[PDB]
Amino acid sequence: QPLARDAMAYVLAGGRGSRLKELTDRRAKPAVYFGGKARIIDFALSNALNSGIRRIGVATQYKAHSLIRHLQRGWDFFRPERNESFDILPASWYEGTADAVYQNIDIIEPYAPEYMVILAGDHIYKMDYEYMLQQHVDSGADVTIGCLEVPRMEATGFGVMHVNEKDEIIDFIEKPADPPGIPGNEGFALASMGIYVFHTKFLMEAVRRDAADIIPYIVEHGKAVAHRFADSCVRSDFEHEPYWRDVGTIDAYWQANIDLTDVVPDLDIYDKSWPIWTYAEITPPAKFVHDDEDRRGSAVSSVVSGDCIISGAALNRSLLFTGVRANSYSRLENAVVLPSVKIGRHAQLSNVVIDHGVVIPEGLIVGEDPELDAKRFRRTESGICLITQSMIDKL
């Protein structure tokens, strides 16, 4: 009996993405657009669905308006008569991650799932959660915790799990200077994905027995085991390794998107085997016009969504979301361009993330003058400008 039939996925989607700065000023991190493909939250949601988990809850917190609208419009196909449910819970004040689940016990117990699968909604990755449920029951564990096997140095910006010979967890440190290594495989550490499988009876206990803090109390006073991302990752034939991304900074967000322009991308957005569902509208095709001595609308080494009209504009190494209008004599290079952006004639922009809906003035130049760029816009140390409508308005 597939254990997924009896599980509920509970998605924590209050993450602010503080380090994305003005990208997350009027939206939560899980609402952030990714890949010309989806919003970040759709990865976790899609994994649950693809894994056979048909009961999903999503707890929101900060600036959730657009996230909730997205869920309402995109994730609307679950029917309770078929033992399917999708609950949007702005329960999660809020006060904590644990409280996000606690305060909606009265939504959970009616469904009576045998298993809870707690998921962070702010990471991009694909995983078949049935593996982790089978480990969780077979192992007799109180909690199974999803983990990345990363080099000890890279584990420094992570909650890290110190394990023993058979993967049982003996301690946990937040951001360790010298991350405890894996026994017999030192120089790799086991970092926390913030993915926790429980028995539901147990967790209601844990939540209503310590609610009115932290559940690594289980580590010390109980039985926590570790599940490795590599044991249940989903990989397409065109992905050379298990893909996971945090896109925690403007650099990392830019990079993950622009990497999709590669000839052989790390993430395969063309894969059908483990599909990412999202909110999408019927959209006309992308259009390229003008082929002149002075202007040519085309794209090279780029990803272009539908309803994009590239009119005498030159795009190189760029990713455009739906709705973009790029106008004559403009040029984009190394640009990640969110939906519905307009690029005026003669504008030239390089190494930018352009926010949703921004109208870029005729003639604007970005990525020529680093000093002017840092005055007008959010510039990273690496040279990426994040451009919003409010930065454009005060020029």
From Swiss-Prot:
GO terms for molecular function: ATP binding; glucose-1-phosphate adenylyltransferase activity. This is Glucose-1-phosphate adenylyltransferase. PANTHER family: GLUCOSE-1-PHOSPHATE ADENYLYLTRANSFERASE (PTHR43523:SF2), GLUCOSE-1-PHOSPHATE ADENYLYLTRANSFERASE-RELATED (PTHR43523). Involved in the biosynthesis of ADP-glucose, a building block required for the elongation reactions to produce glycogen. Catalyzes the reaction between ATP and alpha-D-glucose 1-phosphate (G1P) to produce pyrophosphate and ADP-Glc. Pathway: Glycan biosynthesis; glycogen biosynthesis. The lineage of its organism: Bacteria, Pseudomonadati, Pseudomonadota, Alphaproteobacteria, Hyphomicrobiales. It is an enzyme of class 2 (transferase). It comes from Rhizobium radiobacter (Agrobacterium tumefaciens). Homotetramer. Keywords: ATP-binding, Carbohydrate metabolism, Glycogen biosynthesis, Glycogen metabolism, Nucleotide-binding, Nucleotidyltransferase, Transferase. Its EC number is 2.7.7.27. It comes from the Bacteria. InterPro entries: ADP-Glc_PPase, ADP_Glu_pyroP_CS, GlgC_bac, GlmU/GlgC-like_hexapep, NTP_transferase_dom, Nucleotide-diphossugar_trans, Trimer_LpxA-like_sf. It catalyses: alpha-D-glucose 1-phosphate + ATP + H(+) = ADP-alpha-D-glucose + diphosphate. The keyword NAD does not apply. GO terms for biological process: glycogen biosynthetic process.
